[PDB]
Amino acid sequence: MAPERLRSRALSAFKLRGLLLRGEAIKYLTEALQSISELELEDKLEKIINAVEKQPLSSNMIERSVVEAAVQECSQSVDETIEHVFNIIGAFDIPRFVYNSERKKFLPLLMTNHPAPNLFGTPRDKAEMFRERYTILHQRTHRHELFTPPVIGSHPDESGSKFQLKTIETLLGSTTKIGDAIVLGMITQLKEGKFFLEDPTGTVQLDLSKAQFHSGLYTEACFVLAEGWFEDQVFHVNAFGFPPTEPSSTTRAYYGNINFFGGPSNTSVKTSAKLKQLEEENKDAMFVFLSDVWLDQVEVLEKLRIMFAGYSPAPPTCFILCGNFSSAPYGKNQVQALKDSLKTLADIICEYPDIHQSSRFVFVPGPEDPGFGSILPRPPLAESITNEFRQRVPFSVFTTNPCRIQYCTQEITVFREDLVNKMCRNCVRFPSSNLAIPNHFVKTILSQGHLTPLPLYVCPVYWAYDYALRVYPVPDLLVIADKYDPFTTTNTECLCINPGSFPRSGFSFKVFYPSNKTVEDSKLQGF
Amino acid sequence: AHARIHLRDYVIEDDVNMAIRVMLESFIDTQKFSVMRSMRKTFARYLSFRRDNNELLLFILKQLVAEQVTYQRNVPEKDLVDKARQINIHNLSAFYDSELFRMNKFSHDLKRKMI
Amino acid sequence: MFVSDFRKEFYEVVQSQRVLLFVASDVDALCACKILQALFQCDHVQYTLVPVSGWQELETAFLEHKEQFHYFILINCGANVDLLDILQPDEDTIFFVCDTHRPVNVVNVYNDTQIKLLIKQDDDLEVPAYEDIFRTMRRRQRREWEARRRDILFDYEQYEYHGTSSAMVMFELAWMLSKDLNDMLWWAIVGLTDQWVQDKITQMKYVTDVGVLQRHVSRHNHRNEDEENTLSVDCTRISFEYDLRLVLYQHWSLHDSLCNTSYTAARFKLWSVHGQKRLQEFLADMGLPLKQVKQKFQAMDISLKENLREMIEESANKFGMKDMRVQTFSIHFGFKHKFLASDVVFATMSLMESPEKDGSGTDHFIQALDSLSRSNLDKLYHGLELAKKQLRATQQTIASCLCTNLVISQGPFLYCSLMEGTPDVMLFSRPASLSLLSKHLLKSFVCSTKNRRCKLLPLVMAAPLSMEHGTVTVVGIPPETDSSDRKNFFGRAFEKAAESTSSRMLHNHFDLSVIELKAEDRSKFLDALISLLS
Amino acid sequence: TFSQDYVANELTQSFFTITQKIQKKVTGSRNSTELSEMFPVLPGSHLLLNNPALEFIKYVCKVLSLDTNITNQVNKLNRDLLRLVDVGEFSEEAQFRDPCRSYVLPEVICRSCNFCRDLDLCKDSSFSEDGAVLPQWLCSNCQAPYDSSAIEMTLVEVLQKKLMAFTLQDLVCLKCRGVKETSMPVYCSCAGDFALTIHTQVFMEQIGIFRNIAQHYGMSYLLETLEWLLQKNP
Amino acid sequence: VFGRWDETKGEDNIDFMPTILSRFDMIFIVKDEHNEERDVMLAKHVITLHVSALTQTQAVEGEIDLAKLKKFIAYCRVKCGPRLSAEAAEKLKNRYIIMRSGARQHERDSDRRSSIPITVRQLEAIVRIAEALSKMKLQPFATEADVEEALRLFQVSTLDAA
């Protein structure tokens, strides 16, 4: 085709749509379109212009990179992809949204006055953690059926389905011995035995002589609906309860499909037709999850060899190895032992090259593993430890703890901490045994909407990064890796699972199939 | 005001020293009699009771004379005041009315300008 | 090479081409740029215009633009250095150089293929012959030739100075093209008056160039007007004036202009407490009431304005000011707009050297360049206000320096320096305004002192540039005398002193007599200069 | 006692001469890219040392001002020599500061002698030993070394527990000076703002201490932890 | 009353009647608290200010000229009259009750009436302070943040009455 007419028509095609091409962009475009004639040229131009406009364009002027991506997408090249299909997101990479009350909308921080998060936070940020936790739970609470009736919704007035809400500052006043007060607030043992409630407006004593408590494991720093009456600067509790939990369908139906989970997608990955198709392109799309994988033990390494033997047929897309990787985490000794662990793991992986090229391997280190273990979100394992594994197994990613894994349209959260024991020791009211403890824990986590519903000295967190620990909206998987007990539970279209601790589960572990969201037990105890 | 007394169009360090002296001596006068010793030592040592600065000009003169005598053997007042206008010691008249250059056998004359 | 005919072998070449203008930030460069802009806009030449103010900036812009443009025009920059060495261009590029700086570098002179100079060959030029500059008993003869080479090159490169105005050169080109407008002639006049105001040229050369431009003014006036029937009042009318030396006296009160003109201020010593009484002696000799002198000139009584120039001249003669009148020009358009060439020079210069910390120096350049067009007359008036502020600050600084006696002899040259944080040191941080201040200050000093030897000395002046980098600007001024050639050696003296001292000198400005030093280097640098000038 | 004054006069002569000597020699040194580059760097170094005659004057006058109560002539020498350098008294640059960020690891135990002693990691003269720093880090009962590997790991552990102290610190209102009671407030009981009990600059100073320690002793794992800790900052 | 504010004497430092004190929307007890850092920076500012009496009266970044500020105040005064938003009024109501209870309990603990009262005039003072803050921005309504800044300013003026 004539280069001058091809250039003129391509420039005109972009110009009529209001787009300007730089010299490199138009040159590359003419080279890419040189093999096409008038039977296809204009349709090709319209298609690639649509591909350009789909991208996050910041200006009418187009660099060569944008048209490169557009024409490559027009030429496919996304067949059997891993990008857009499987992402591991570090906790520091999660977008920092903030809920604005006047707009009643989540805004990204670039659209606000909020500063960037950093470890050495201000005195304000320490309060901002709990203030934002209250804010998210507050906007969650007021959208429940407890909301006031509409305009003459009932001929007699109703008290918000008998669940009308108030804050602490409102009842510090004329409302003495009002028998129907309900307040959202944080439980605190602000004096020993003399518990208090707190919200962003103020504080008040809790007379919890009767608790009448709904199922859930109550601790200090838990936010609760305290139902009771007020007298003598004391809130006399009639009942305690958590705020009701939302499904992600409800949350995204209200706020739209914002990508709260993070990752490359601008929208929530749960709503995408192409990604819905790519999720099911492999009927046995599959992942494996383990924890406390003590590779400083020869026994763990040999049993891992047997597990690779067992999953040579139908290998996963990725193996997920949660942390506390060591029998003996005790410093320099374990730095060298983890180097040896990863050398031996690379040897084993090269002894199964089919699994090496078929599966990825990701690591979520625990609080006891070497490095900045004790404060969350933990950074990844030290790069000097990983370096040989980086070059010998490029099909692997050491990442933060917690980390967010996305597989196509589904949301997986991975977090290593022995939190059930922490929660039950910081318990305010010993729960009823009729519901199992992992169900109590999962209900508490989902209702509190946070991975660490405990005081800061119980769960040390970098203050400005506390949003990364937030469970909101509810994901597809809560992979809470914990010594306590391997388990599987579910609520609000999530499956909340624990792979246990591999040396103490008798070397049992978990398997997950996102194509049908099923979970299977690797019951390989005699392996 | 001190610059105005000297008919100066611009305030200099000597005027600032005088103002500081007036302020501090008045403040010391307002103290109890027992406290005046400690207060006076506190301000006098550190805060610029700048009485005189003869030693620098003495050794500047001695250095210039040593170099000049060494040069001669193998207008000195101009040589003296050149280094005095280079370094921030410009009020040279105190050095000439002080005994430090006199017992070192130096002397001055506005006509001959030899020292 | 020198261009022999601007029309054929420069303008008709670039007329067919895309061009890149590099322009220095000085009023003569701005006027030449305006003239060349108007020509290119008449002929639809696709030019790009880039301001520059130093060698680093010119190098950066050329590195940014070298791939796209082959034809370059440098206005008031590039002649006095080896452009091939500095810029490292491709051999197919061509550099036109309309630069007033002298002496022209011999490489630029004798580079035939690439460097073309838009410089009059009948300017004061003394280029050495090619065989003197470019290539056992034969070895001895070669070494003798090299000794001759270094001697003659030092004699050639010692003194720097300025030739004919670039604005005048561009207006000559416009006249040859027969596309010369009255506004182009005004820009030429302002370009010459920039050299005269900044004392870049001798009085004799200024009078000669004014004699040249008188003929052009007469031609433009008689192009469409005579003494019987005349043009509209809207049309621009340029008139030759044998006017007063006082600065901005038509926009000020006469008291302020007598206060802030460097000539009268230096004569009467108005920095001193006695100077106001001397000024009152002068005014009483003229018989002007003080309430009229301190009133704005446009509001002064016309009975006094009728013959003010003769009054000021004849009183100035007996008070010892021998050359109060100056040959110059003015432009009139509309009913109320009247400016002298010196007024436009000061307004544009104040706009360009404005002390405001807004945007960038290129932004201030853009405001100055816009002000030279009559569609942006408001910018010209704003520049006149900034000129009021600049001149007042200049006199305040001179009074401070002379009262506190910062100006001090150091043997073969006077030395002065401005300290950080003093009043209005920010206005003179920039090198060009600092050079102008140093000239005015030296005139005031030599008018003040009784020491006849000190009246003959040059001046070296320094001021802060960047506290974060710990640097000072330094400038060198020749002796201020009535019969000076306005040649100075401080470029080569600064270079040789810095080299002999291994000093951290950044030589970024186009005048070689303007430099940047790391501040602590100044002591050994000044000692080296003292030992060098001897 | 009174001989303080005699030596003070002798120094009034000699100190002048010596300052002139070093001033003219160091300012004329052509190898100086900047005079700040002239100074040696030890693991305790933090000050922006700039003008060697001035540092020399300051250190000399510090010891002279502390080895007698008769400081009058020392103060006069300060005035005279600072004016000879043409640098002002009462300025920040005229104030003495300790050139060494001294940092002590206490109670370090040695099995070669079964003895415990306190160890300063910034004080030592790393130029003269480098790899021999561990022999230089001897137990004072004997000359037996303390090792780099365990000390590096100890410094990282110190950083972990320190960062825990910062992250779990108390906060105090600038007006009602009690500690912040609850998580709710942005302003305290009165409308004053809150402030850190463990300020960020304490941790920047100690991070600089450990960074210079690791740089001068080649502690790469500590440098990994420190580089991450430095990156995630304002 | 005693020249300087004397903290030992408490309410005796004020001779103004409660009736006229109630009419002031905001009362500052601006004490001069000695501190070396503030004193050094203040003295440097003062001396540079005295030096800056010669520098052409140049303007400063992030600042409005006095004439422009005057004309802007006149424009905002004649043009904009704000009101309180409903939830902002609710917030101010609750905070007023807490403030009044605190003042009453302080007076009871001292067993002496405080010199500076806290009354409905102080409530309306907070209202019009919030409206002034909104009028600066030409907004028809005062937000919860405007009321928060008004409460902060009045809390400074109320710590000055503790």
mmCIF file with all atom_site columns, N, CA and C in Angstrom, chain A residues 118-120 123 126-127 130-131 198-200 332 371-372 374-375 383-384 456 460-463, chain D residues 149 152-153 160 163-164 166-169 171 180 182-185 204 221 224-225 228 232-234:
data_model
loop_
_atom_site.group_PDB
_atom_site.id
_atom_site.type_symbol
_atom_site.label_atom_id
_atom_site.label_alt_id
_atom_site.label_comp_id
_atom_site.label_asym_id
_atom_site.label_entity_id
_atom_site.label_seq_id
_atom_site.pdbx_PDB_ins_code
_atom_site.Cartn_x
_atom_site.Cartn_y
_atom_site.Cartn_z
_atom_site.occupancy
_atom_site.B_iso_or_equiv
_atom_site.pdbx_formal_charge
_atom_site.auth_seq_id
_atom_site.auth_comp_id
_atom_site.auth_asym_id
_atom_site.auth_atom_id
_atom_site.pdbx_PDB_model_num
ATOM 1   N N  . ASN A 1 118 ? 3.336   5.888   55.061 1.00 0.00 ? 118 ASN A N  1
ATOM 2   C CA . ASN A 1 118 ? 4.734   5.605   55.354 1.00 0.00 ? 118 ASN A CA 1
ATOM 3   C C  . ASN A 1 118 ? 4.837   5.037   56.762 1.00 0.00 ? 118 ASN A C  1
ATOM 4   N N  . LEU A 1 119 ? 5.959   4.360   57.026 1.00 0.00 ? 119 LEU A N  1
ATOM 5   C CA . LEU A 1 119 ? 6.117   3.643   58.290 1.00 0.00 ? 119 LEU A CA 1
ATOM 6   C C  . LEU A 1 119 ? 6.141   4.598   59.475 1.00 0.00 ? 119 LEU A C  1
ATOM 7   N N  . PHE A 1 120 ? 6.875   5.704   59.353 1.00 0.00 ? 120 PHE A N  1
ATOM 8   C CA . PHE A 1 120 ? 7.022   6.666   60.445 1.00 0.00 ? 120 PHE A CA 1
ATOM 9   C C  . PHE A 1 120 ? 5.865   7.665   60.392 1.00 0.00 ? 120 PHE A C  1
ATOM 10  N N  . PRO A 1 123 ? 1.341   11.508  64.583 1.00 0.00 ? 123 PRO A N  1
ATOM 11  C CA . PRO A 1 123 ? 0.395   11.204  65.672 1.00 0.00 ? 123 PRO A CA 1
ATOM 12  C C  . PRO A 1 123 ? -1.047  11.118  65.207 1.00 0.00 ? 123 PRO A C  1
ATOM 13  N N  . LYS A 1 126 ? -2.140  7.431   63.827 1.00 0.00 ? 126 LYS A N  1
ATOM 14  C CA . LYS A 1 126 ? -2.455  6.401   64.812 1.00 0.00 ? 126 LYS A CA 1
ATOM 15  C C  . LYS A 1 126 ? -3.934  6.434   65.178 1.00 0.00 ? 126 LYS A C  1
ATOM 16  N N  . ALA A 1 127 ? -4.491  7.632   65.356 1.00 0.00 ? 127 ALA A N  1
ATOM 17  C CA . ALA A 1 127 ? -5.930  7.757   65.556 1.00 0.00 ? 127 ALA A CA 1
ATOM 18  C C  . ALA A 1 127 ? -6.700  7.467   64.274 1.00 0.00 ? 127 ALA A C  1
ATOM 19  N N  . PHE A 1 130 ? -8.176  3.802   63.688 1.00 0.00 ? 130 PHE A N  1
ATOM 20  C CA . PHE A 1 130 ? -9.420  3.415   64.335 1.00 0.00 ? 130 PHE A CA 1
ATOM 21  C C  . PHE A 1 130 ? -10.579 4.283   63.873 1.00 0.00 ? 130 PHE A C  1
ATOM 22  N N  . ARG A 1 131 ? -10.308 5.555   63.564 1.00 0.00 ? 131 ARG A N  1
ATOM 23  C CA . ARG A 1 131 ? -11.349 6.417   63.021 1.00 0.00 ? 131 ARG A CA 1
ATOM 24  C C  . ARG A 1 131 ? -11.851 5.890   61.680 1.00 0.00 ? 131 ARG A C  1
ATOM 25  N N  . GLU A 1 198 ? -16.224 3.550   72.956 1.00 0.00 ? 198 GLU A N  1
ATOM 26  C CA . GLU A 1 198 ? -15.744 4.774   72.315 1.00 0.00 ? 198 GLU A CA 1
ATOM 27  C C  . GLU A 1 198 ? -16.122 4.803   70.841 1.00 0.00 ? 198 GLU A C  1
ATOM 28  N N  . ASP A 1 199 ? -16.435 6.009   70.358 1.00 0.00 ? 199 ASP A N  1
ATOM 29  C CA . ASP A 1 199 ? -16.693 6.284   68.950 1.00 0.00 ? 199 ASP A CA 1
ATOM 30  C C  . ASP A 1 199 ? -16.028 7.622   68.627 1.00 0.00 ? 199 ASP A C  1
ATOM 31  N N  . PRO A 1 200 ? -16.041 8.099   67.376 1.00 0.00 ? 200 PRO A N  1
ATOM 32  C CA . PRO A 1 200 ? -15.363 9.371   67.068 1.00 0.00 ? 200 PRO A CA 1
ATOM 33  C C  . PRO A 1 200 ? -15.940 10.597  67.776 1.00 0.00 ? 200 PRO A C  1
ATOM 34  N N  . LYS A 1 332 ? 20.943  -15.788 62.405 1.00 0.00 ? 332 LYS A N  1
ATOM 35  C CA . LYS A 1 332 ? 21.926  -16.115 61.368 1.00 0.00 ? 332 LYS A CA 1
ATOM 36  C C  . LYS A 1 332 ? 21.843  -17.577 60.961 1.00 0.00 ? 332 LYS A C  1
ATOM 37  N N  . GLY A 1 371 ? 13.841  -11.076 59.354 1.00 0.00 ? 371 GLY A N  1
ATOM 38  C CA . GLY A 1 371 ? 13.563  -9.757  58.813 1.00 0.00 ? 371 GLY A CA 1
ATOM 39  C C  . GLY A 1 371 ? 12.646  -8.958  59.729 1.00 0.00 ? 371 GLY A C  1
ATOM 40  N N  . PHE A 1 372 ? 11.902  -8.025  59.126 1.00 0.00 ? 372 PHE A N  1
ATOM 41  C CA . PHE A 1 372 ? 10.907  -7.225  59.849 1.00 0.00 ? 372 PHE A CA 1
ATOM 42  C C  . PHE A 1 372 ? 9.621   -8.030  60.057 1.00 0.00 ? 372 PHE A C  1
ATOM 43  N N  . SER A 1 374 ? 7.885   -8.766  62.886 1.00 0.00 ? 374 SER A N  1
ATOM 44  C CA . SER A 1 374 ? 6.981   -8.542  64.008 1.00 0.00 ? 374 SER A CA 1
ATOM 45  C C  . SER A 1 374 ? 5.931   -7.459  63.771 1.00 0.00 ? 374 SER A C  1
ATOM 46  N N  . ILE A 1 375 ? 6.058   -6.639  62.726 1.00 0.00 ? 375 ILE A N  1
ATOM 47  C CA . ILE A 1 375 ? 5.127   -5.546  62.445 1.00 0.00 ? 375 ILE A CA 1
ATOM 48  C C  . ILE A 1 375 ? 4.542   -5.769  61.057 1.00 0.00 ? 375 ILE A C  1
ATOM 49  N N  . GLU A 1 383 ? 15.868  -10.223 50.321 1.00 0.00 ? 383 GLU A N  1
ATOM 50  C CA . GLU A 1 383 ? 16.253  -10.540 48.949 1.00 0.00 ? 383 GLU A CA 1
ATOM 51  C C  . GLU A 1 383 ? 17.589  -11.270 48.895 1.00 0.00 ? 383 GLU A C  1
ATOM 52  N N  . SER A 1 384 ? 18.489  -10.979 49.836 1.00 0.00 ? 384 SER A N  1
ATOM 53  C CA . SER A 1 384 ? 19.749  -11.710 49.907 1.00 0.00 ? 384 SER A CA 1
ATOM 54  C C  . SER A 1 384 ? 19.518  -13.191 50.183 1.00 0.00 ? 384 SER A C  1
ATOM 55  N N  . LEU A 1 456 ? -3.521  -2.522  69.222 1.00 0.00 ? 456 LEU A N  1
ATOM 56  C CA . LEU A 1 456 ? -2.325  -2.356  68.402 1.00 0.00 ? 456 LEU A CA 1
ATOM 57  C C  . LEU A 1 456 ? -1.131  -3.102  68.987 1.00 0.00 ? 456 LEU A C  1
ATOM 58  N N  . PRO A 1 460 ? 0.765   -5.469  66.110 1.00 0.00 ? 460 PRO A N  1
ATOM 59  C CA . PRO A 1 460 ? 1.529   -4.286  65.680 1.00 0.00 ? 460 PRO A CA 1
ATOM 60  C C  . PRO A 1 460 ? 1.412   -4.042  64.182 1.00 0.00 ? 460 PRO A C  1
ATOM 61  N N  . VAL A 1 461 ? 1.055   -2.807  63.831 1.00 0.00 ? 461 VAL A N  1
ATOM 62  C CA . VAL A 1 461 ? 0.774   -2.408  62.457 1.00 0.00 ? 461 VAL A CA 1
ATOM 63  C C  . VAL A 1 461 ? 1.420   -1.053  62.204 1.00 0.00 ? 461 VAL A C  1
ATOM 64  N N  . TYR A 1 462 ? 2.058   -0.911  61.044 1.00 0.00 ? 462 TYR A N  1
ATOM 65  C CA . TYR A 1 462 ? 2.434   0.412   60.567 1.00 0.00 ? 462 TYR A CA 1
ATOM 66  C C  . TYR A 1 462 ? 1.164   1.215   60.325 1.00 0.00 ? 462 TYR A C  1
ATOM 67  N N  . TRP A 1 463 ? 1.075   2.388   60.962 1.00 0.00 ? 463 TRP A N  1
ATOM 68  C CA . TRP A 1 463 ? -0.221  3.034   61.179 1.00 0.00 ? 463 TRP A CA 1
ATOM 69  C C  . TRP A 1 463 ? -0.902  3.397   59.866 1.00 0.00 ? 463 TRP A C  1
ATOM 70  N N  . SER D 2 149 ? 29.537  -11.178 62.536 1.00 0.00 ? 149 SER D N  1
ATOM 71  C CA . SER D 2 149 ? 28.278  -11.837 62.195 1.00 0.00 ? 149 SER D CA 1
ATOM 72  C C  . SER D 2 149 ? 27.245  -11.670 63.306 1.00 0.00 ? 149 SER D C  1
ATOM 73  N N  . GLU D 2 152 ? 26.277  -7.925  63.747 1.00 0.00 ? 152 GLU D N  1
ATOM 74  C CA . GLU D 2 152 ? 25.332  -7.487  62.720 1.00 0.00 ? 152 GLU D CA 1
ATOM 75  C C  . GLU D 2 152 ? 23.925  -7.969  63.046 1.00 0.00 ? 152 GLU D C  1
ATOM 76  N N  . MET D 2 153 ? 23.804  -9.245  63.412 1.00 0.00 ? 153 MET D N  1
ATOM 77  C CA . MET D 2 153 ? 22.490  -9.777  63.754 1.00 0.00 ? 153 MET D CA 1
ATOM 78  C C  . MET D 2 153 ? 21.925  -9.080  64.989 1.00 0.00 ? 153 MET D C  1
ATOM 79  N N  . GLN D 2 160 ? 14.764  -4.009  65.204 1.00 0.00 ? 160 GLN D N  1
ATOM 80  C CA . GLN D 2 160 ? 13.403  -4.540  65.285 1.00 0.00 ? 160 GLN D CA 1
ATOM 81  C C  . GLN D 2 160 ? 12.717  -4.096  66.572 1.00 0.00 ? 160 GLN D C  1
ATOM 82  N N  . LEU D 2 163 ? 12.043  -0.283  66.516 1.00 0.00 ? 163 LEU D N  1
ATOM 83  C CA . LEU D 2 163 ? 10.919  0.057   65.650 1.00 0.00 ? 163 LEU D CA 1
ATOM 84  C C  . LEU D 2 163 ? 9.597   -0.372  66.268 1.00 0.00 ? 163 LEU D C  1
ATOM 85  N N  . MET D 2 164 ? 9.598   -1.473  67.025 1.00 0.00 ? 164 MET D N  1
ATOM 86  C CA . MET D 2 164 ? 8.407   -1.843  67.782 1.00 0.00 ? 164 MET D CA 1
ATOM 87  C C  . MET D 2 164 ? 8.071   -0.786  68.826 1.00 0.00 ? 164 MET D C  1
ATOM 88  N N  . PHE D 2 166 ? 8.784   2.422   68.729 1.00 0.00 ? 166 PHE D N  1
ATOM 89  C CA . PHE D 2 166 ? 8.233   3.570   68.008 1.00 0.00 ? 166 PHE D CA 1
ATOM 90  C C  . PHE D 2 166 ? 6.789   3.311   67.600 1.00 0.00 ? 166 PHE D C  1
ATOM 91  N N  . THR D 2 167 ? 6.529   2.145   67.008 1.00 0.00 ? 167 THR D N  1
ATOM 92  C CA . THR D 2 167 ? 5.218   1.887   66.426 1.00 0.00 ? 167 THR D CA 1
ATOM 93  C C  . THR D 2 167 ? 4.135   1.762   67.494 1.00 0.00 ? 167 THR D C  1
ATOM 94  N N  . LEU D 2 168 ? 4.503   1.358   68.714 1.00 0.00 ? 168 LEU D N  1
ATOM 95  C CA . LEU D 2 168 ? 3.579   1.225   69.833 1.00 0.00 ? 168 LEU D CA 1
ATOM 96  C C  . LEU D 2 168 ? 3.729   2.350   70.856 1.00 0.00 ? 168 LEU D C  1
ATOM 97  N N  . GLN D 2 169 ? 4.293   3.488   70.458 1.00 0.00 ? 169 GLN D N  1
ATOM 98  C CA . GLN D 2 169 ? 4.594   4.547   71.410 1.00 0.00 ? 169 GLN D CA 1
ATOM 99  C C  . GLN D 2 169 ? 3.320   5.213   71.923 1.00 0.00 ? 169 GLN D C  1
ATOM 100 N N  . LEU D 2 171 ? 1.392   8.938   72.860 1.00 0.00 ? 171 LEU D N  1
ATOM 101 C CA . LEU D 2 171 ? 1.266   10.268  72.279 1.00 0.00 ? 171 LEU D CA 1
ATOM 102 C C  . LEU D 2 171 ? 0.785   11.232  73.353 1.00 0.00 ? 171 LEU D C  1
ATOM 103 N N  . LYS D 2 180 ? -2.300  10.565  75.539 1.00 0.00 ? 180 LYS D N  1
ATOM 104 C CA . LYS D 2 180 ? -3.535  10.345  74.794 1.00 0.00 ? 180 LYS D CA 1
ATOM 105 C C  . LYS D 2 180 ? -4.275  9.123   75.326 1.00 0.00 ? 180 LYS D C  1
ATOM 106 N N  . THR D 2 182 ? -7.431  7.658   74.431 1.00 0.00 ? 182 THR D N  1
ATOM 107 C CA . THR D 2 182 ? -8.213  6.773   73.572 1.00 0.00 ? 182 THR D CA 1
ATOM 108 C C  . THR D 2 182 ? -7.874  7.030   72.108 1.00 0.00 ? 182 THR D C  1
ATOM 109 N N  . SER D 2 183 ? -8.415  6.164   71.246 1.00 0.00 ? 183 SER D N  1
ATOM 110 C CA . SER D 2 183 ? -8.153  6.205   69.811 1.00 0.00 ? 183 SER D CA 1
ATOM 111 C C  . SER D 2 183 ? -8.963  7.268   69.072 1.00 0.00 ? 183 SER D C  1
ATOM 112 N N  . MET D 2 184 ? -10.096 7.684   69.633 1.00 0.00 ? 184 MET D N  1
ATOM 113 C CA . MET D 2 184 ? -10.995 8.655   69.004 1.00 0.00 ? 184 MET D CA 1
ATOM 114 C C  . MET D 2 184 ? -10.349 9.971   68.566 1.00 0.00 ? 184 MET D C  1
ATOM 115 N N  . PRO D 2 185 ? -9.596  10.701  69.398 1.00 0.00 ? 185 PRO D N  1
ATOM 116 C CA . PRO D 2 185 ? -9.403  12.133  69.116 1.00 0.00 ? 185 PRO D CA 1
ATOM 117 C C  . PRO D 2 185 ? -8.329  12.453  68.085 1.00 0.00 ? 185 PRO D C  1
ATOM 118 N N  . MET D 2 204 ? 15.798  8.579   62.911 1.00 0.00 ? 204 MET D N  1
ATOM 119 C CA . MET D 2 204 ? 16.683  8.919   61.802 1.00 0.00 ? 204 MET D CA 1
ATOM 120 C C  . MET D 2 204 ? 18.135  8.980   62.263 1.00 0.00 ? 204 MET D C  1
ATOM 121 N N  . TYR D 2 221 ? 23.617  -7.525  55.258 1.00 0.00 ? 221 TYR D N  1
ATOM 122 C CA . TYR D 2 221 ? 22.250  -7.873  55.648 1.00 0.00 ? 221 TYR D CA 1
ATOM 123 C C  . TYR D 2 221 ? 21.599  -6.738  56.434 1.00 0.00 ? 221 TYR D C  1
ATOM 124 N N  . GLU D 2 224 ? 20.571  -4.290  53.945 1.00 0.00 ? 224 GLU D N  1
ATOM 125 C CA . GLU D 2 224 ? 19.303  -4.626  53.298 1.00 0.00 ? 224 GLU D CA 1
ATOM 126 C C  . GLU D 2 224 ? 18.126  -4.140  54.134 1.00 0.00 ? 224 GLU D C  1
ATOM 127 N N  . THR D 2 225 ? 18.137  -4.488  55.426 1.00 0.00 ? 225 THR D N  1
ATOM 128 C CA . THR D 2 225 ? 17.051  -4.069  56.309 1.00 0.00 ? 225 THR D CA 1
ATOM 129 C C  . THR D 2 225 ? 16.966  -2.548  56.385 1.00 0.00 ? 225 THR D C  1
ATOM 130 N N  . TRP D 2 228 ? 15.490  -0.978  53.073 1.00 0.00 ? 228 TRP D N  1
ATOM 131 C CA . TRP D 2 228 ? 14.030  -1.035  53.057 1.00 0.00 ? 228 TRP D CA 1
ATOM 132 C C  . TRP D 2 228 ? 13.433  -0.040  54.044 1.00 0.00 ? 228 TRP D C  1
ATOM 133 N N  . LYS D 2 232 ? 10.702  3.363   52.692 1.00 0.00 ? 232 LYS D N  1
ATOM 134 C CA . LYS D 2 232 ? 9.292   3.585   53.020 1.00 0.00 ? 232 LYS D CA 1
ATOM 135 C C  . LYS D 2 232 ? 9.124   4.770   53.979 1.00 0.00 ? 232 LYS D C  1
ATOM 136 N N  . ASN D 2 233 ? 9.607   5.936   53.555 1.00 0.00 ? 233 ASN D N  1
ATOM 137 C CA . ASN D 2 233 ? 9.678   7.137   54.375 1.00 0.00 ? 233 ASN D CA 1
ATOM 138 C C  . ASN D 2 233 ? 9.045   8.325   53.664 1.00 0.00 ? 233 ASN D C  1
ATOM 139 N N  . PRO D 2 234 ? 8.682   9.394   54.412 1.00 0.00 ? 234 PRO D N  1
ATOM 140 C CA . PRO D 2 234 ? 8.355   10.662  53.746 1.00 0.00 ? 234 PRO D CA 1
ATOM 141 C C  . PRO D 2 234 ? 9.547   11.265  53.005 1.00 0.00 ? 234 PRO D C  1
#
